[model samples]
Target chain A: NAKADQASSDAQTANAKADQASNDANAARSDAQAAKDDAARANQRADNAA
Target chain B: NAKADQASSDAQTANAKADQASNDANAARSDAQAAKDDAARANQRADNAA
Candidate 1:
């Protein structure tokens, strides 16, 4: 018996892209946190300068 | 003879949701990439500050 509403080939391609996107987002979030800390420091310096 | 194509009601719903999910994932990835690029640019600026 075949899978009911068996996923099309296109669906599999989409699945792979989705997986890549999920991983990329996770990595980007981690790096972004580091950047945010750096930005906060710069903001503090600007405030002190004024 | 029992046909494999005997359509289950749930199959249609699952297929629709999967398709929607695929599109949503693609759009979200695009947005996330933009955010990541912005963060990288911010990091470069921070390096210049030091």
Candidate 2:
């Protein structure tokens, strides 16, 4: 009985960690896109100047 | 019983999305690193020319 209870709790903890990791990944992806956009804009400006 | 089933389903869905997010973040990190490397190389070339 106690084992079943522990398993349920463990599953919940694992799920929470997964959720946290997913959120972090989403944020990282957002940052990456932002950087790419900035680079593109800089390149465009350089092209214009040339 | 059905509640537990639904919870399991929800967890699975969340896990799938989390997996996808991780893959995307990994790819984005790679791309960002490549951009940084390119910038570094450009700087090196400019310095050498100067």
Which candidate leads in lDDT?
2
TM-scores of all predicted structures: 0.47, 0.67
Native-referenced Cα lDDT, model 2: 0.68
**Candidate 1 C-alpha lDDT tens digits along A8-42:** 44355556665665666666566666666666666
lDDT of 1 by residue, B1-50 (tens): 13324343344555566667656656656665665677666656655663
C-alpha positional error of residue B22 in candidate 2 after TM-score superposition, expressed in Å: 2.2
Q: In candidate 2, which residue ranges exceed 4 Å CA deviation?
A: B1-18, B38-50
- As a TM-score, model 2 comes out at 0.67
Model 2 chain A lowest lDDT segment of ten? A41-50
Error of 1 at A8 (Å): 12
Segments of candidate 1 deviating more than 4 angstroms: A1-50, B1-7
DockQ of each: 0.25, 0.38
At residue A32, give the lDDT of candidate 2: 73
Residue B32 of model 2, lDDT score: 84
Candidate lDDT scores, in order, read 0.57, 0.68
Output the number of the DockQ-best candidate: 2
